[PDB]
Amino acid sequence: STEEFGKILLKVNQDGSRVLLRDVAKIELGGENYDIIAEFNGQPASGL
Amino acid sequence: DLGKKLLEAARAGRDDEVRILMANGADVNAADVVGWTPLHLAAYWGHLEIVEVLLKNGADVNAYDTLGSTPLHLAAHFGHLEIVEVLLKNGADVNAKDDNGITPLHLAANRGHLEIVEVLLKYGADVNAQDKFGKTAFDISINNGNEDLAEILQ
């Protein structure tokens, strides 16, 4: 899940505070690539 | 042998076999290889009917396995709300710790079960209690990023 990837520990600071991955990045499910976008009669679609 | 047939039945959720084997004087606190009583198995696999039938026949509600985990630890962790209440009603230690110092609140909090967290708190769970790494249920909720849970634990 995105929740689990978000709470990945990158480092612990001198003052005891933690730097998690969600503190330097946005975590979300998204395409392997975003090149191909299909459309069926103007309506958003996928296909094979 | 008789107590071993009870362990299988408590796991498999057979309501008849548990009651019928109990009539023939089956050990309610029979331990498997890892130290799991029938009450551990019923709490884990979420068999509410068998938890009540076992407790009725004087099952050890604070029986602990070879790593110190109780049926309340298992119920709280795997989100079985009704079983947490039934166990706490039968005098389960709400502030029970396994060898790691992990309490049923730690587990419930970590797995995001808000309804169970509130019941454990109601029955007198120690919010400030620590595990071996010095983590409270509040620390877990902050790290897991659960603001609904964080505001309940303050």
Side-chain angles (χ1 to χ4, degrees):
Chain A
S1 66
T2 57
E3 289 84 10
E4 289 178 351
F5 271 94
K7 73 191 176 80
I8 285 169
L9 180 60
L10 297 179
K11 73 197 291 176
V12 201
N13 293 314
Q14 288 160 211
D15 66 323
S17 65
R18 295 193 309 282
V19 189
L20 308 182
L21 182 56
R22 71 196 175 194
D23 300 328
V24 301
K26 314 198 174 186
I27 324 301
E28 61 177 35
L29 293 182
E32 292 181 31
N33 78 308
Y34 288 73
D35 296 310
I36 302 162
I37 290 169
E39 217 152 293
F40 173 74
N41 295 329
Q43 192 189 345
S46 195
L48 301 173
Chain B
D1 189 53
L2 188 67
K4 202 213 67 152
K5 193 178 159 70
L6 174 56
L7 282 165
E8 290 170 6
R11 170 170 159 194
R14 282 191 290 278
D15 288 21
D16 285 53
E17 269 211 61
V18 169
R19 277 189 282 263
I20 294 289
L21 284 170
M22 219 72 81
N24 299 46
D27 187 357
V28 286
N29 303 338
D32 73 357
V33 186
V34 295
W36 279 33
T37 54
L39 194 62
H40 279 92
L41 289 165
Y44 183 85
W45 294 105
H47 298 307
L48 177 56
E49 316 316 324
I50 291 163
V51 167
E52 287 174 336
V53 169
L54 282 164
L55 286 163
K56 194 201 290 160
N57 286 69
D60 188 359
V61 74
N62 294 338
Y64 56 80
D65 63 19
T66 51
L67 298 165
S69 200
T70 60
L72 181 57
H73 276 92
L74 298 177
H77 196 207
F78 281 73
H80 296 108
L81 175 52
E82 290 153 299
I83 294 171
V84 170
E85 284 174 350
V86 165
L87 285 168
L88 285 165
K89 277 215 299 291
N90 284 248
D93 184 359
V94 70
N95 299 295
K97 287 182 168 170
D98 70 5
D99 297 3
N100 315 298
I102 290 165
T103 63
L105 190 69
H106 280 85
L107 290 178
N110 190 52
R111 236 65 160 179
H113 294 119
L114 300 171
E115 293 177 53
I116 291 168
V117 165
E118 286 181 324
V119 170
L120 292 167
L121 288 166
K122 191 199 296 176
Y123 275 87
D126 184 8
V127 290
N128 298 117
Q130 293 180 5
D131 60 28
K132 64 195 294 180
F133 309 111
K135 302 298 187 175
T136 59
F138 181 75
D139 293 325
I140 285 166
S141 63
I142 290 286
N143 195 68
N144 282 17
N146 195 337
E147 285 149 24
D148 289 31
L149 178 55
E151 72 182 350
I152 294 164
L153 297 168
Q154 301 161 21

